[PDB]
From a paper:
ERα contains structurally conserved globular domains of the nuclear receptor superfamily, including a DNA‐binding domain (DBD) that is connected by a flexible hinge region to the ligand‐binding domain (LBD), as well as unstructured AB and F domains at its amino and carboxyl termini, respectively. The LBD contains a ligand‐dependent coactivator‐binding site called activation function‐2 (AF‐2). AF‐2 binds the signature LxxLL motif peptides of coactivators such as NCOA1/2/3 (also known as SRC‐1/2/3). In the canonical model of the ERα signaling pathway, E2‐bound ERα forms a homodimer that binds DNA at estrogen‐response elements (EREs), recruits NCOA1/2/3 (Metivier et al, 2003; Johnson & O'Malley, 2012), and activates the GREB1 gene, which is required for proliferation of ERα‐positive breast cancer cells (Ghosh et al, 2000; Rae et al, 2005; Deschenes et al, 2007; Liu et al, 2012; Srinivasan et al, 2013).
The 2,5‐DTP analogs showed perturbation of h11, as well as h3, which forms part of the AF‐2 surface.
Residue numbers in the entry:
A (entry chain B): 305 to 332, 335 to 460, 467 to 533, 535 to 548
B (entry chain A): 305 to 461, 470 to 548
C (entry chain C), D (entry chain D): 687 to 696
Amino acid sequence: SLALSLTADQMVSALLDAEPPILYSEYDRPFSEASMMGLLTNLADRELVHMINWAKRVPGFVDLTLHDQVHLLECAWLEILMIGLVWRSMEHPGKLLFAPNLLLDRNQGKCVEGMVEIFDMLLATSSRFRMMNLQGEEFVCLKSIILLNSGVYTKSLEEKDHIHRVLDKITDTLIHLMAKAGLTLQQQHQRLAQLLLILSHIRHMSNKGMEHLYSMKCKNVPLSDLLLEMLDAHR
Amino acid sequence: SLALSLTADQMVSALLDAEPPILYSEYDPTRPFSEASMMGLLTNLADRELVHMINWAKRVPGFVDLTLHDQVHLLECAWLEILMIGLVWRSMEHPGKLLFAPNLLLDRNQGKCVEGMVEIFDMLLATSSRFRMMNLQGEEFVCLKSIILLNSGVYTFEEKDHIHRVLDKITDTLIHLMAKAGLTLQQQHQRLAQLLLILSHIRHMSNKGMEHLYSMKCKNVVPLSDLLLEMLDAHR
Amino acid sequence: HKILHRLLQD
Amino acid sequence: HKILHRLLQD
Ligand SMILES: C[C@]12CC[C@H](c3cc(F)c(O)c(F)c3F)C[C@H]1CC[C@@H]2O
Ligand SMILES: C[C@]12CC[C@H](c3cc(F)c(O)c(F)c3F)C[C@H]1CC[C@@H]2O
């Protein structure tokens, strides 16, 4: 059972408790292209280890085979990292809070070739979160949706529908939070739509990021074996 | 306003009536398929569909209210998405096959002729099977296709606020359709979520399709029209 | 200029 | 097997 027995409040509290910690960077003194890529990828690699523990605490995820778990994390890992980054950077307009000791504005994305286009997309998403006044309870719901949805496309004894049952539960949970916040029925549906359309942009940013990360890897500009494997799954 | 003053039923009628026709391919059954020839076929089709899409977009409520530069940007960002959701939609009642055209119905085995394309066919086929599993309705389809047009490039930007009002209105329209179909209140927001989550997959397929198309162009596999070259150049 | 830009006016 | 495989188990 597990997931489907949870109430809307239990879902929220479970997702909140499962949240990973905010890690620090190696930073510092000024940057170079190799140095910048070093800090960012190092950070991502350590966050990845924490993400995996977090995934196993997302309700319904442990009920999946190890094959399906791998496939989902392989597909969604950069989306999960990015929505996290975007969430952390909410209260810092025009800046990306990769870490408490690593706060990068737009211009510093130019330190690495082609990265500024990505920063711009991340920043605009953060500005959108801010504009919507996105709440923490909503954020952890969206991040879980990304995990379960992004690769939900494998004939046998599915399952798959159980993932769609869990997905429906998280939808109910989001609505519950909005109805609790005093939103009218019409406002609930609209806000839900707005939040989920953001997931389309996050997917876009992840695809672009995967292209860029692969471009830097395929030119020897030094990634961990874990990162290389995560990167090899998108090719 | 105008676009905002519409009812839900008026929103649907306008979209259904703005639908582009089903086009044919230049498929010749006298000759076998090569990698170059099928790429030629598929891109020739896409190019002709693009012209109709442009005239369709102008009939999407609120789109003409935007500046010419915003119209260009939205179409540049979403064009392959819009093609793919259309393809996936008309392939619904053809399990295991992609109906690019009435005279061009392809399964995954025929995708293998072009390197790297069968992976893209597989994704498109999975999405089509998903629409079929959900029993996606035409009224829902035209709403989704419009949402893609207005949303996909809206964050690469006070008229940005105008787009969101239109997007909100399509949301109101979607819910309206579900309520009229008999769906309970809970089923309404659940289905709304299910439909919108598909757009993330469609975005993904467009991104993979975009770089694959770029790959073929840079290998001189297929000559792309000046329009397609310009649409393609917008993503890099 | 851009073809798309022109087609959006015709 | 894969690193990701190992991490999910452990
Ligand atoms: C090296 C990159 C730098 C940004 C990105 C990234 C890193 C993080 F540590 C993080 O927490 C995060 F959310 C995030 F998006 C990862 C790659 C993608 C393309 C870039 O070149
Ligand atoms: C040539 C490709 C073949 C498929 C694709 C495409 C063509 C259509 F005419 C269409 O109506 C449609 F929906 C569609 F997706 C376009 C490019 C993307 C990647 C491939 O290389």
